[PDB]
Design a protein around this ligand. Structure first.
Ligand code: ADP
Ligand code: ADP
Ligand code: MG
Lengths: 276, 270, 7, 372, 187
């Protein structure tokens, strides 16, 4: 059925490697061979993808880009920038912002206390990343959501990469839970395809003060946590060749010398004595 | 448009997760029906272990030992399901096919420490061309979870002088890894690769056709696994590093000043 | 031996 | 006034001199010798440790220890003897009034450089010092601001791609295979014909036999067939006791271990694949610049025929549109030192010495944020 | 032993007498567990001396010289040699092996051949190798009570295998490539 064929299209599209949505989309369109079906069905899948990517976009005439997220989804293909307190229509196919409208409670103080400290963490540690503080109330609890994205794409060096991150804090006086999720994807396509995909949960708790100093607790945790996660990854790639990647296949035999294909019967005889 | 459909479908299989290629490729076939026989015969697939009940050694399934909807087991030379008119190699080749199945079982044992392997052979007008299949999966513990899939295609141009032959190998390697720790989270690495090479080695009683390809395969797999470890240890490492510094890196005036002085001095000196 | 050591 | 001192002090040999000359003043084997037997004759002078060239001269009664192993200092109380000998017996100048430039192989533990600067400041009282990367200077010695330097000292190997002077720290490939491993493997393969060199002194005999006769062949299998079919690759050597040994196949089997480390029991890649990975690990817009300006260096690259062999291997690895060109200077052995004498003699480098005042106000760790 | 026995006043220099020296060695000498403590034991009170009778009927008496001969295994400096003892030799040979397999190596360290049949060599080897290897590792010096012929026993076991019935270099094979064929077949 064209519903299932379109369902298979959403499968393929929503797994597109970061920065390669357009290249997947053209082939999926041409293989489906129906722009009308794809324009009526896949408009959900494109939105699913642009949220999963925390897609950054430049609002025209404004000083910083904004991150497309479910935490900013207003329906109608509108999204919120909580920094300027304005919403825009977003083109989920073209990645264009349009129609900036005013989109003005007690979370404001927190929204600010956090955002400048978060932009300081971005300025300190990210080369070309972005961030946003969304804020919401859940069952009367004040909930602050801090989002980070970084993405380098180089279709002339043949590699694409992304480092997304999301954090939650909920005011539970004199304390809070801290929930973090760190997500990475990367792909290299020079004469072969190699892909890293990796997600980590982080969780901790904090003791409250005024909003300002409480924010510096939040950032000091996030800094320590991302520093440890990236450290763990660097040590892991410096250790896999002799442990994990060594598990699947051995770089060289226990002999530490290539096989001597003349002698090949001799390699039986140890295992003969395990039956003897 | 048909090749434009075909070249676009092959661009999909470079831009998907490699853990589910045998799922995505079936899905791509599921979406379009006109490309069934092509992509099963053109792009690679992870293998499929079937069971031998006569002798009791596992083996692998591909298109070269396939006749109709059955598959030739190399350890018994009988198709399962039982066919009474299949495709058999010559009595010259059955001597070699067990010999190459002895050697690449031994290359399976020293390098992988487990897994399954298979060799098949078929004939050409002036030589023989074969296939070497190898699969090894995770042993059961969680840091090992993932599979390796090696597929080779050799061909041999036996020159009628009887001294030297022309060897040609087109290898591909499918890989997927998943490691889990408390500090590193959950890394689901993986990928794929293909290469080819040639050789003109002499053939004699001191270096037969079994020992000739036996140096050809384990050299190419070493040249493939070494540089595949230098894509992980290569780009996918410092791409992740090149996305922030743990350190506030300062300005560089005098370092750059020394660079400039060196440049100016070497404009005369060189 | 021939060089170094007797044998 | 005062002229800066340059001291390589890499594995195997210490090369030191004054900055401004075109050759190191003193080159001596960086070893330390302890007497293996107890003296019986008095009134003729007895030392508990011969250092430098004296040790190699009297190696027949000494146990010889190299203070550096694989580029990492293993016994500092002998490295201090090495430096004291360098300063007072070869250069003949007190270090307390001469700034010094030292070299370090890349990717060496931070504790090594830290202890190095701490010793150089607190024991020898030098007014100021600096630590440069051992491979970067060798690209200055050739005048190339950009290019890939393959340095292969006697004990360590490293390939460093450097563009516009700023070396790329993400493509610096280390390799533990070097001259000392080639000496060990040469001993092990000499055992095949019946020659057993096993003592610490005889390692210098086999080391000299390698530095003199060994050579890298273009095609290994063809040369193996040649050395098997006839006796035209036989060469004779004369030990320092008069015996005459003869080596055939072993002449090129030993150095070829650089290109196939499997021969030596090493899982790593050869030096040609290492250089190709160092060129492939960087951008695709400068990969070509690196291919045309490949600079060799270090003593282990002084083998006859390594240039053509490296060129063949790299052009077989690299694409067919890139032009390969191996730049092999005629004085590679001292290339790292020469490049130093340039860097120290620059009129813009004298604002980069770690001054003793700066040291005491910031501790040793300042070396980790002053030297790149 | 032919050298250290002179300090007592004995002279064996003839090849016929080297056999008597070998017989005294494999009858009285024994490795000590703490060489310095046994030296102090011998210097404190003579209770280690044993009487041996040559084929002439003289009654020689070796005391301290019992363990000074086998100790030369662990300290080749006594023989004017530079290399290290047998324990450090085994330690370096093991640490040259692949890291993953080392865990099983330290458990199956086996002594063999004649010279390892010294009284007390097992405990000494174990102490030395466990003081050299880390404490997490399990050191087992397995010493078969018939290790004088273990090489031949293993050769017989290997030769009796049907799988080994194809590994014999045959005469007709020898005629093809000359004696050099031995370098190819044998590992
Ligand atoms: N042609 C050669 N063949 C073999 N070994 C050589 C050759 N040339 C130099 N070497 C080795 O390299 C050493 C010189 O290296 P050098 O340039 O001083 O760097 P390092 O100070 O790290 O040893 C020699 O002493 C020798 O062991
Ligand atoms: N208990 C022992 N103490 C000292 N030496 C011994 C002992 N047992 C055997 N040996 C010595 O070991 C050697 C015998 O070892 P063996 O296994 O026969 O090897 P080989 O065949 O090379 O002699 C002889 O020198 C013998 O005197
Ligand atoms: Mg050097």
């Amino acid at each position: 059925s064209d519903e299932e064929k379109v369902r298979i299209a959403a499968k393929f599209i929503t797994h597109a490697p970061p920065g390669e949505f357009n290249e997947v989309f053209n082939d999926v369109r041409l293989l489906l061979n129906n722009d009308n079906l794809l324009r009526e069905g896949a408009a959900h899948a494109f939105a699913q993808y642009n949220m999963d990517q925390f897609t950054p976009v430049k609002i025209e005439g404004y000083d910083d880009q904004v991150l497309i997220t479910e935490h900013g989804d207003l329906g109608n293909s509108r999204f919120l920038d909580p920094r300027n307190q304005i919403s825009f229509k977003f083109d989920h196919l073209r990645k264009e912002a349009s129609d900036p409208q005013p989109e003005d409670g007690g979370l404001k103080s927190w929204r600010e206390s956090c955002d400048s400290a978060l932009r300081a963490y971005v300025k300190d540690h990210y080369s070309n990343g972005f961030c946003t503080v969304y804020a919401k109330t859940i069952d009367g609890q004040q909930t602050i959501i801090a989002c980070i994205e970084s993405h380098q794409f180089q279709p002339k060096n043949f590699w694409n990469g992304r480092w997304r991150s999301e954090w939650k804090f909920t005011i539970t006086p004199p304390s809070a839970q801290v929930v973090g999720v760190l997500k990475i994807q990367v792909h290299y396509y020079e004469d072969g395809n190699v892909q890293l995909v990796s997600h980590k949960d982080v969780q901790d708790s904090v003791t409250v003060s005024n909003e300002v100093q409480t924010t510096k607790e939040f950032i000091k945790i996030i800094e320590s946590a991302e520093n440890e996660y990236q450290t763990a990854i660097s040590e892991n790639y410096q250790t896999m060749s002799d442990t994990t990647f060594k598990a699947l296949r051995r770089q060289l035999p226990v002999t530490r010398t290539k096989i001597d294909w003349n002698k090949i019967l001799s390699y039986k005889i140890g295992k003969e004595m395990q039956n003897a | 448009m048909s090749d434009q459909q075909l070249d676009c479908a092959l661009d999909l299989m470079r831009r998907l997760p490699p853990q589910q290629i045998e799922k995505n490729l079936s899905d791509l076939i599921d979406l379009v029906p006109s490309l069934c026989e092509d992509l099963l015969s053109s792009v690679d697939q992870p293998l499929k272990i079937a069971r031998d009940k006569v002798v009791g050694k596992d083996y692998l399934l591909c298109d070269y030992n396939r006749d109709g909807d059955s598959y030739r087991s190399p350890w018994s030379n009988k198709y399962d399901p039982p066919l009474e008119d299949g495709a058999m190699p010559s009595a010259r080749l059955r001597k070699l096919e067990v010999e190459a199945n002895n050697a690449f079982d031994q290359y399976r044992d020293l390098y992988f420490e487990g897994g399954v392997s298979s060799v098949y052979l078929w004939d050409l007008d002036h030589g023989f061309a074969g296939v070497i299949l190898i699969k090894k999966a995770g042993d059961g513990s969680k840091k090992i979870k993932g599979c390796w899939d090696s597929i080779h295609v050799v061909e041999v141009q036996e020159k009628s002088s009887g001294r030297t032959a022309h060897y040609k190998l087109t290898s591909t390697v499918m890989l997927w890894l998943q490691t889990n720790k408390s500090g590193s989270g959950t890394m689901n690495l993986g990928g794929s690769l293909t290469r080819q090479m040639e050789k003109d080695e002499t053939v004699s009683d001191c270096s037969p056709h079994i020992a000739n390809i036996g140096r050809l395969v384990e050299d190419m797999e070493n040249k493939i696994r070494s540089t595949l470890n230098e894509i992980y240890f290569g780009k996918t490492k410092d791409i992740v590093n090149g996305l922030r510094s743990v350190q506030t890196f300062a300005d560089k005036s005098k370092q750059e000043a020394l660079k400039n002085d060196l440049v100016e001095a070497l404009k005369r000196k060189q | 031996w021939x060089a170094x050591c007797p044998a | 006034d005062i002229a800066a001192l340059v001291v390589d002090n890499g594995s195997g040999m210490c090369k030191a001199g004054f900055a401004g000359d075109d050759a190191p003043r003193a080159v001596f084997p960086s070893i330390v010798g302890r007497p293996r037997h107890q003296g019986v004759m008095v009134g003729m002078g007895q030392k508990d440790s011969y250092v430098g060239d004296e040790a190699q001269s009297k190696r027949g009664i000494l146990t010889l220890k190299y203070p550096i192993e694989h580029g990492i200092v293993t016994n500092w109380d002998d490295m201090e003897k090495i430096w004291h000998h360098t300063f007072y017996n070869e250069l003949r100048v007190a270090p307390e009034e001469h700034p010094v430039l030292l070299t370090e192989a890349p990717l060496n533990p931070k504790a090594n450089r830290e202890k190095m600067t701490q010793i150089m400041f607190e024991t020898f009282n030098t007014p100021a010092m600096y630590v440069a990367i051992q491979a970067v200077l060798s690209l200055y010695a050739s005048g190339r601001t950009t290019g890939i330097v393959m340095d292969s000292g006697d004990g360590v190997t490293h390939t460093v791609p450097i563009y516009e002077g700023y070396a790329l720290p993400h493509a610096i490939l280390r390799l533990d295979l070097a001259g000392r491993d080639l000496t060990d493997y040469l001993m092990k393969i000499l055992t095949e014909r019946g020659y057993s060199f096993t003592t610490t002194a005889e390692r210098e005999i086999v080391r000299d036999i390698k530095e003199k006769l060994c050579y890298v062949a273009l095609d290994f299998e063809q040369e193996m067939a040649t050395a098997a079919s006839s006796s035209s690759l036989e060469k004779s050597y004369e030990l320092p006791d008069g015996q005459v040994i003869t080596i055939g196949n072993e002449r090129f089997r030993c150095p070829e271990a650089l290109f196939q480390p499997s021969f030596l029991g090493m899982e790593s890649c050869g030096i040609h694949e290492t250089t190709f990975n160092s060129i492939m690990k960087c951008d695709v817009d400068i990969r070509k610049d690196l291919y045309a300006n490949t600079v060799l260096s270090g003593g282990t690259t002084m083998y006859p025929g390594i240039a053509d062999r490296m060129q063949k291997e790299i052009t077989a690895l690299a694409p067919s549109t890139m032009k390969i060109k191996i730049i092999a200077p005629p004085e590679r052995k001292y290339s790292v030192w020469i490049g130093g004498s340039i860097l120290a003699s620059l009129s813009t480098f004298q604002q980069m010495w770690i001054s003793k005042q700066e040291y005491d106000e910031s501790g040793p760790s300042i070396v980790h944020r002053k030297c790149f």
